[PDB]
Design an enzyme around this catalytic site. Structure first.
Site, PDB file in Angstrom:
ATOM      1  CG  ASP A 149       7.380  -3.115   3.963  1.00  0.00           C
ATOM      2  OD1 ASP A 149       6.506  -3.965   3.681  1.00  0.00           O
ATOM      3  OD2 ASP A 149       8.095  -3.190   4.985  1.00  0.00           O
ATOM      4  CG  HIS A 222       3.575  -9.795  -0.903  1.00  0.00           C
ATOM      5  ND1 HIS A 222       4.064 -10.962  -0.358  1.00  0.00           N
ATOM      6  CD2 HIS A 222       3.723  -8.843   0.049  1.00  0.00           C
ATOM      7  CE1 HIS A 222       4.491 -10.726   0.869  1.00  0.00           C
ATOM      8  NE2 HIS A 222       4.294  -9.449   1.141  1.00  0.00           N
TER       9      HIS A 222
HETATM   10  C1  HEM Z   1      11.175  -9.927   0.731  1.00  0.00           C
HETATM   11  C2  HEM Z   1      10.147 -10.136   1.562  1.00  0.00           C
HETATM   12  C3  HEM Z   1       8.913  -9.205   1.590  1.00  0.00           C
HETATM   13  C4  HEM Z   1       8.729  -8.055   0.922  1.00  0.00           C
HETATM   14  C5  HEM Z   1       9.705  -7.349  -0.050  1.00  0.00           C
HETATM   15  C6  HEM Z   1       7.418  -7.551   1.270  1.00  0.00           C
HETATM   16  C7  HEM Z   1       6.850  -6.391   0.795  1.00  0.00           C
HETATM   17  C8  HEM Z   1       5.572  -5.951   1.054  1.00  0.00           C
HETATM   18  C9  HEM Z   1       4.956  -4.776   0.485  1.00  0.00           C
HETATM   19  C10 HEM Z   1       5.622  -3.803  -0.511  1.00  0.00           C
HETATM   20  C11 HEM Z   1       3.715  -4.668   0.965  1.00  0.00           C
HETATM   21  C12 HEM Z   1       2.797  -3.497   0.545  1.00  0.00           C
HETATM   22  C13 HEM Z   1       1.496  -3.379   1.322  1.00  0.00           C
HETATM   23  C14 HEM Z   1       1.698  -3.022   2.770  1.00  0.00           C
HETATM   24  O1  HEM Z   1       2.855  -2.932   3.256  1.00  0.00           O
HETATM   25  O2  HEM Z   1       0.661  -2.837   3.450  1.00  0.00           O
HETATM   26  C15 HEM Z   1       3.485  -5.790   1.871  1.00  0.00           C
HETATM   27  C16 HEM Z   1       2.346  -6.091   2.594  1.00  0.00           C
HETATM   28  C17 HEM Z   1       2.171  -7.140   3.474  1.00  0.00           C
HETATM   29  N1  HEM Z   1       3.077  -8.145   3.749  1.00  0.00           N
HETATM   30 FE1  HEM Z   1       4.917  -8.368   2.840  1.00  0.00          FE
HETATM   31  N2  HEM Z   1       6.837  -8.431   2.158  1.00  0.00           N
HETATM   32  C18 HEM Z   1       7.723  -9.466   2.379  1.00  0.00           C
HETATM   33  C19 HEM Z   1       7.509 -10.555   3.205  1.00  0.00           C
HETATM   34  C20 HEM Z   1       6.372 -10.814   3.951  1.00  0.00           C
HETATM   35  C21 HEM Z   1       6.136 -11.970   4.799  1.00  0.00           C
HETATM   36  C22 HEM Z   1       7.140 -13.126   5.005  1.00  0.00           C
HETATM   37  C23 HEM Z   1       4.915 -11.842   5.345  1.00  0.00           C
HETATM   38  C24 HEM Z   1       4.168 -12.778   6.326  1.00  0.00           C
HETATM   39  C25 HEM Z   1       4.776 -13.800   6.935  1.00  0.00           C
HETATM   40  C26 HEM Z   1       4.345 -10.602   4.873  1.00  0.00           C
HETATM   41  C27 HEM Z   1       3.101 -10.112   5.214  1.00  0.00           C
HETATM   42  C28 HEM Z   1       2.509  -8.986   4.689  1.00  0.00           C
HETATM   43  C29 HEM Z   1       1.191  -8.473   5.013  1.00  0.00           C
HETATM   44  C30 HEM Z   1       0.185  -9.080   6.017  1.00  0.00           C
HETATM   45  C31 HEM Z   1       0.993  -7.370   4.291  1.00  0.00           C
HETATM   46  C32 HEM Z   1      -0.286  -6.507   4.315  1.00  0.00           C
HETATM   47  C33 HEM Z   1      -1.392  -7.273   3.593  1.00  0.00           C
HETATM   48  C34 HEM Z   1      -2.700  -6.529   3.665  1.00  0.00           C
HETATM   49  O3  HEM Z   1      -3.411  -6.657   4.696  1.00  0.00           O
HETATM   50  O4  HEM Z   1      -3.039  -5.818   2.685  1.00  0.00           O
HETATM   51  N3  HEM Z   1       5.257 -10.005   4.025  1.00  0.00           N
HETATM   52  N4  HEM Z   1       4.646  -6.546   1.889  1.00  0.00           N
END
Ligand code: HEM
Ligand code: HEM
Ligand SMILES: [Zn+2]
Ligand SMILES: [Zn+2]
Lengths: 306, 306
Positions: A149, A222
């Site tokens: 993450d 996601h």
């Molecule tokens: C259980 C809840 C969540 C989990 C387990 C999770 C997990 C992850 C993981 C593993 C990544 C991998 C890519 C990275 O970190 O760049 C990611 C990216 C990302 N997450 Fe989540 N996330 C969660 C909730 C959220 C929420 C609620 C939001 C927004 C309100 C969010 C926004 C983002 C964004 C913007 C990225 C990067 C996207 C990009 O520009 O490539 N995440 N998340």
């Protein structure tokens, strides 16, 4: 000039205190005491930073739209700030609170010291804490899904300033819109899924966190849900999310995002929770949001001028 | 030759997993799997120590008298080992469990990694965890009473070996008797007490932790209750206790002691809880024990030979 929870990266511990302000707007004595306690917080932040540089201590006190008019009659309300409860018709778990205290550190002892001292200063007469979460980074910065993450989290002072802070010259410059959301992971459902399903769910490889090309991952992955742009501008946010919980009990991700614009966050919530195309984020089959709040962290100057 | 939770000092994090063994003595397949998981634990301890020397990782798996005959038909039962429930007539909170996994570290991420991996290896089919506690050291090694904890803890390998480990040449040499006891602090009752009362309660000064001379402190002070000798020998124990809990909720001290003899621990429990002179420890007016267990941590060799 910003409060110190946005620009720093890779914190190892984070304490989240969310609750409601128990002081009323006309209670001048209580309000004076409350603002003296804010001053004490900013001072203790500096003090700990000085005696424990290794902690890379950071801290912010943030406020909801409901409470803005109560804590200040001088600083104009941030134009986008609103209650997260207005999303309850399509996003579960909403629980808007008045106040967020977010503290980060590379050591739990200084993280806890600042959090405990601050709550003791405020006391039950000023804050009704509804949620206290002790977040901690895991090996390889991996979420409890065991995916890394933070990969495409904006990197460096310049990009985290651009996407994380209100732009200079604007009202409330160097403050930040804040969204908090505690997730409870359903790992019994997640662990048995084959690797291809788990990576289809996220949009990146599990081992190295290599982005699967958007052409080849589902639009409900996601990354497809959250990697958004509008009129050619990336709607990037600054995440300080940390794992939390018990190995043998309730655990998940304490999500927190800081942004120059609340809309950058809200558009991603609308995408994840079906409000843009009628499809939900595949990750939500394995994890559930149980709290939620919008805040605004003032700049360090406006925090002391409330 | 001992498991690595006795001799090391000043750990910053500790995870405590206490529960019951779900495998029966005649279940050879389950028993083989269970002991393979013990081997995996010892190996992962070594692996983490190698890649993260800064963690000063330590770990022990410990066993109760009830379960001894189930996990081994080869290693004789430690002669003093018994259930802590036999103290229930005068000590509250007793809850004897079969198994203790105690892991210590200077970093939470490696502490949690070893704990989570180990529980995932064992699984709910082998361990019913009744208690999982995340302990953490506070600034200046202070208990939540804000007194320093650890001052007269035996210092160094020689003294911690003498008081902490079964003496060489004896049966079960280099193992250790273990007592765990989770305390819930009643700080609303503690904080308002004047300094003189608080120091009368402990037996040392709050700021510097200077021992108040035994002649001038009450016989019910904590130090008078626990600083015991018998036939000229100090009944010293090795404590790895750590604070735990929520700032805005339940918190206290996760007490754990390692000793060359269970009697060194039990005599102090008898003193604190009125069984020697009919007077209780003054500290117990402000904190309550809610769990309790006796175990024995085998040496590293006997652990693998069970
Ligand atoms: C259980 C809840 C969540 C989990 C387990 C999770 C997990 C992850 C993981 C593993 C990544 C991998 C890519 C990275 O970190 O760049 C990611 C990216 C990302 N997450 Fe989540 N996330 C969660 C909730 C959220 C929420 C609620 C939001 C927004 C309100 C969010 C926004 C983002 C964004 C913007 C990225 C990067 C996207 C990009 O520009 O490539 N995440 N998340
Ligand atoms: C809430 C529970 C407890 C608290 C807050 C507490 C706190 C303290 C403190 C502040 C000290 C200061 C001196 C030092 O650390 O050397 C101390 C000493 C000590 N404690 Fe406790 N303690 C607790 C429970 C226990 C229990 C259950 C035992 C034994 C079963 C124990 C055995 C000892 C011993 C042996 C010493 C050192 C005595 C000496 O040789 O001077 N403690 N404790
Ligand atoms: Zn838009
Ligand atoms: Zn005796």
């Amino acid at each position: 000039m910003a409060q110190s929870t946005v620009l720093p990266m890779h914190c190892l511990y984070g304490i989240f205190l969310e609750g409601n302000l128990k002081i009323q707007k006309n209670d001048q004595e209580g309000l004076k005491k409350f603002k003296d306690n804010i001053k004490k917080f900013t001072l203790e932040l500096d003090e700990i930073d000085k005696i424990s540089p290794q902690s890379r201590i950071g801290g912010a006190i943030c406020f909801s739209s409901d409470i803005w008019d109560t804590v200040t009659k001088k600083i104009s309300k941030p134009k986008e700030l609103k209650s997260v409860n207005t999303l309850s018709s399509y996003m579960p778990g909403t629980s808007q609170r008045d106040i967020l205290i977010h503290i980060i550190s590379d050591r739990m002892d200084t993280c806890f010291k600042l959090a405990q001292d601050t709550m003791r200063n405020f006391g039950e007469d000023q804050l009704d804490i509804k949620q206290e979460i002790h977040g901690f980074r895991r090996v390889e910065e991996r979420d409890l899904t065991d995916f890394i993450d933070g990969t495409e989290n904006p990197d460096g002072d310049e990009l985290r300033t651009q996407y994380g802070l209100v732009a200079a010259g604007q009202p409330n410059e160097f403050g930040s819109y804040v969204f908090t959301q505690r997730y409870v992971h359903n790992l019994k459902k997640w662990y048995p899924e084959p690797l291809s399903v788990q990576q289809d769910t996220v949009g990146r490889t599990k081992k190295d966190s290599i982005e699967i090309p958007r052409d080849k991952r589902p639009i409900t992955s996601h990354v497809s849900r959250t990697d958004l742009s509008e009129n050619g501008k990336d709607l990037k946010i600054v995440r300080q999310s940390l794992p939390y919980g018990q190995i043998t009990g309730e655990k998940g991700l304490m999500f927190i995002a800081y942004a120059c614009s609340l809309h950058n966050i809200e558009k991603q919530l609308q995408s994840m929770f079906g409000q843009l195309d009628g499809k939900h984020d595949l990750l939500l089959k394995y994890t559930t949001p149980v709290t939620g709040s919008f805040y605004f962290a003032p700049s360090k100057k406006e925090l002391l001028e409330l």
